[PDB]
Design a protein around this motif. Structure first.
Motif, PDB file in Angstrom:
ATOM      1  N   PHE A 162       3.813  -6.420  10.608  1.00 50.41           N
ATOM      2  CA  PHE A 162       5.157  -6.821  10.210  1.00 50.41           C
ATOM      3  C   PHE A 162       5.936  -5.571   9.813  1.00 50.41           C
ATOM      4  CE2 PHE A 162       4.341  -6.454   5.623  1.00 50.41           C
ATOM      5  CZ  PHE A 162       2.970  -6.650   5.550  1.00 50.41           C
ATOM      6  N   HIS A 212       7.186   4.824   5.540  1.00 49.21           N
ATOM      7  CA  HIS A 212       5.730   4.873   5.468  1.00 49.21           C
ATOM      8  C   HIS A 212       5.128   3.923   6.494  1.00 49.21           C
ATOM      9  CE1 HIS A 212       6.863   1.870   2.271  1.00 49.21           C
ATOM     10  NE2 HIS A 212       5.784   1.214   2.669  1.00 49.21           N
ATOM     11  N   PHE A 254      10.585  -7.997   3.571  1.00 44.65           N
ATOM     12  CA  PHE A 254       9.555  -8.011   4.602  1.00 44.65           C
ATOM     13  C   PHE A 254       9.878  -9.023   5.686  1.00 44.65           C
ATOM     14  CE2 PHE A 254       7.713  -6.682   0.609  1.00 44.65           C
ATOM     15  CZ  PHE A 254       7.080  -5.506   0.963  1.00 44.65           C
ATOM     16  N   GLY A 273       6.449  -0.999  -4.562  1.00 44.15           N
ATOM     17  CA  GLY A 273       6.713  -2.372  -4.924  1.00 44.15           C
ATOM     18  C   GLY A 273       5.613  -3.063  -5.691  1.00 44.15           C
ATOM     19  N   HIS A 297       1.827  -2.527   8.372  1.00 44.32           N
ATOM     20  CA  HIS A 297       3.281  -2.618   8.374  1.00 44.32           C
ATOM     21  C   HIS A 297       3.920  -1.244   8.475  1.00 44.32           C
ATOM     22  CE1 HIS A 297       3.075  -2.191   3.842  1.00 44.32           C
ATOM     23  NE2 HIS A 297       4.302  -1.711   3.959  1.00 44.32           N
ATOM     24  N   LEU A 339      13.999  -7.869  -2.591  1.00 42.38           N
ATOM     25  CA  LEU A 339      13.219  -7.618  -3.791  1.00 42.38           C
ATOM     26  C   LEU A 339      13.557  -6.242  -4.350  1.00 42.38           C
ATOM     27  CD1 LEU A 339       9.876  -8.814  -2.206  1.00 42.38           C
ATOM     28  CD2 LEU A 339      11.034 -10.079  -4.037  1.00 42.38           C
ATOM     29  N   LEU A 377      -5.882  -7.260  -2.664  1.00 35.70           N
ATOM     30  CA  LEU A 377      -6.226  -6.036  -1.958  1.00 35.70           C
ATOM     31  C   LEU A 377      -6.446  -4.901  -2.948  1.00 35.70           C
ATOM     32  CD1 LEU A 377      -3.375  -4.323  -2.230  1.00 35.70           C
ATOM     33  CD2 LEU A 377      -2.765  -5.514  -0.141  1.00 35.70           C
ATOM     34  N   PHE A 397       4.527  -7.737  -7.678  1.00 37.46           N
ATOM     35  CA  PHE A 397       3.434  -8.706  -7.629  1.00 37.46           C
ATOM     36  C   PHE A 397       3.371  -9.529  -8.909  1.00 37.46           C
ATOM     37  CE2 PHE A 397      -1.091  -9.998  -7.741  1.00 37.46           C
ATOM     38  CZ  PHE A 397      -1.162 -10.630  -6.514  1.00 37.46           C
TER      39      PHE A 397
END
Ligand SMILES: Cn1[nH]c(-c2ccccc2)c(C(=O)c2ccc(N3CCCCC3)cc2[N+](=O)[O-])c1=O
Ligand SMILES: Cn1[nH]c(-c2ccccc2)c(C(=O)c2ccc(N3CCCCC3)cc2[N+](=O)[O-])c1=O
Ligand SMILES: [Co+2]
Ligand SMILES: [Co+2]
Lengths: 380, 380
Positions: free
Chosen positions: B343, B186, B332, B364, B259, B319, B216, B368
């Motif tokens: 990134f 993606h 990341f 993911g 990203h 992760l 966000l 969080f």
């Protein structure tokens, strides 16, 4: 003859600064390709809202890579309030330089006794000022005058770790690469007209002609102890093979720095390590000379290099030439970036022991006739 | 729910194009850091007097790096006589883009059945044209519409090796690096306002909301088979920790690509190889989660990963998160260049086998809450 006519006290080459559009990617490529360690930084993480600057070192060789941030990050600043660590930096000049020339050398920096005096004497003797002397944290003085094109000669003097405002890089981010490169031997500029360039630079520095012994004309300016060496080339027009100096000027949009010669303490090791990495992010090298050139090397340098050491030159594609006082091992990279402009020379000199005197063995002029002759011999 | 409402036939992601100031140095850094092979080139050596373009490939992943030459090399050309291999390229646009945004993605390219039809239908449905359909060597059609900021969505269709005018790179210059990366999963954009961006893009593509399950708000647009995935983020203002989306927009001078998520066929191998190279020219990674996060992983994914495979996640700082249909391994990088903007994410998905369906495991979001909770647990 060396008239020792420097108009101010010059020490050694101090650093070379590239102006980039992205300093991170160029610095990381150069580090891996040349075996230089990340030594110091000045960027957002050090409070510099103006430019990102990363320093690579190998021995005494210092390569600085700088790129501008968005001007918006520092729009509230004025020069008295700047967070830039290099006060001569200007967003507009840097973007103008990179868009015009592509990746290339902005500053050839030399350490001097007193950068404010060096600047004053230089300008009093015809140098075009680029950035006036500025004292950083009461500890280092930096000043700049035009050298050729958009390249500046940068004077640096220390009262007594690169520059104030730079931080030492964390050990975890600093891998101790080392392929044997130890210092800058010479830095070469290409100009449209050699005579006026020499008269200008020798005029404000007091540097003297170093003196040697198709395509170009060349002369070398030298400091008092001949440790700062600044060759300048001009094109010779009307040949059959078009002058690579003219090609440079066309692709560079004018005069600029043509090559950096880096001295190795072990050129065999340096080239083994650099060639290992050519196709995995490092640097490529020019085509190797025909075997007949190395067949002819025993006749010219067989008293300096053993047969084994000469076949080792042949494995790595190293060129050898000799003055009346010393011998020169050298090889050239392909251009460092997109444009056929700047490239690197790796060099090692043998002889001229007192320490080693500067320019021992010359700059390779004798290899020109030798390779034309080797081209004819390989064809036969 | 998937209404399968694409307004034209979309196949897969085709390539990502970075606009650079020096394509050589960025491409060489990325090749070494990510394990991608030099596959094709379009530059002076292929007759292109306009731009230097280098293609890196790993599996089906294609990264293109392009920089402009001096406009003087092509001043005699007009568009009917161009030597550019990518006809949408413009010196002024590219310099404007790099000076404004720094190193970043210019084009997200998708392969379609018919790029001329895709362009026409897109513009008929609100897309802002960027470059009209152009047929290259009667073989490939290329067209571009605005996506967000100065990023374009590029349509590519093939009648029947990258693009005409590109040459395959010599084997001697093409080292077969491979760290296991296989395709683009993606590509994520940051914008000031999410709603208008989604309405615009979903309006001209027919892409549907993919749907999940501080800082966000986010939503993902998806093609019919959900293999082209385009998340978009907006900042949430008024927090305590300033929104990293807002930081992006400030340092990027506006909206752009945030990203790229690259799927690995073996994320353990990919991360072993990438981390080996972080300090020798490659990419750095974000800080690793505290050990209590991996202590909590057995309770959430202990039926998908063995204890050994979980401690291997801990060694590499990976992760893990899980949807109702699959599991996600992710990590990341730090920003790819000078600015805290773009990134890379490395990803591997497990489950959703029919082939694997798109977006298996989500993106993911559950990590969080988990890391905030892991932060509290490590402190205890
Ligand atoms: C001060 N000074 N002068 C030269 C110089 C240049 C061209 C001819 C004679 C002397 C310097 C060089 O470094 C240099 C030396 C040998 C080279 N070749 C091997 C023989 C066949 C031609 C290519 C290329 C370069 N070069 O400039 O790329 C240099 O530093
Ligand atoms: C479409 N979509 N959404 C997210 C996303 C972003 C932020 C919160 C929730 C979901 C995507 C991500 O990739 C992503 C996933 C986990 C991340 N972290 C681990 C937990 C603590 C915060 C940092 C950071 C990112 N990220 O965006 O850098 C993504 O592709
Ligand atoms: Co030289
Ligand atoms: Co993601």
């Amino acid at each position: 003859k060396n008239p020792k006519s420097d108009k101010f006290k010059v020490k050694r080459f101090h650093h070379i600064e590239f102006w980039c559009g992205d300093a991170t990617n160029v610095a990381r490529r150069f580090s891996w390709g040349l075996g230089m360690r990340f030594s110091a930084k000045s960027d957002l993480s050090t409070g510099n809202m103006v430019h990102a600057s990363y320093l690579l070192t190998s021995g005494d060789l210092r390569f600085l890579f700088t790129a501008p941030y968005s001007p918006s990050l520092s729009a509230g600043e004025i020069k008295p309030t700047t967070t830039a660590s290099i006060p001569s930096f200007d967003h507009g000049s840097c973007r103008s330089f990179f868009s015009s020339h592509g990746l290339g050398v902005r500053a050839v920096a030399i350490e001097v006794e007193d950068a404010e005096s060096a600047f004053s004497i230089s300008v009093a003797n015809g140098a075009i000022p680029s950035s006036p002397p500025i004292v950083l944290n009461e500890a280092v003085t930096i000043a700049e005058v035009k050298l050729y094109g958009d390249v500046v000669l940068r004077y640096v003097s220390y009262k007594a770790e690169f520059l104030p405002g730079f931080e030492r890089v964390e050990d975890a981010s600093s891998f101790p690469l080392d392929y044997g490169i130890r210092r800058l031997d010479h830095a070469v500029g290409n100009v449209p007209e050699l005579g006026p360039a020499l008269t200008y630079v020798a005029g404000f520095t007091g540097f003297h002609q170093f003196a040697e012994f198709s395509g170009l004309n060349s002369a070398v300016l030298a400091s008092n102890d001949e440790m700062v060496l600044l060759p300048i080339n001009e094109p010779v027009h009307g040949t059959k093979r078009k002058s690579q100096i003219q090609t440079y000027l066309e692709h560079n949009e004018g005069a600029g720095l043509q090559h950096l010669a880096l001295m190795s303490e072990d050129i065999f090791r340096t080239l083994r390590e650099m060639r290992k990495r050519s196709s995995i992010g490092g640097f490529d090298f020019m085509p190797s000379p025909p075997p007949t050139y190395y067949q002819n090397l025993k006749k010219r340098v067989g008293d300096v290099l053993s047969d084994d050491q000469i076949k080792e030159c042949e494995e790595l594609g190293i060129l050898v030439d000799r003055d009346d006082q010393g011998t020169l091992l050298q090889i050239f990279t392909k251009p460092l970036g997109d444009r056929p402009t700047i490239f690197i020379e790796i060099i090692q000199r043998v002889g001229c022991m007192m320490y080693q005197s500067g320019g021992c063995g010359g700059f390779g002029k004798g290899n020109f006739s030798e390779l034309f002759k080797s081209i004819e011999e390989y064809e036969k």
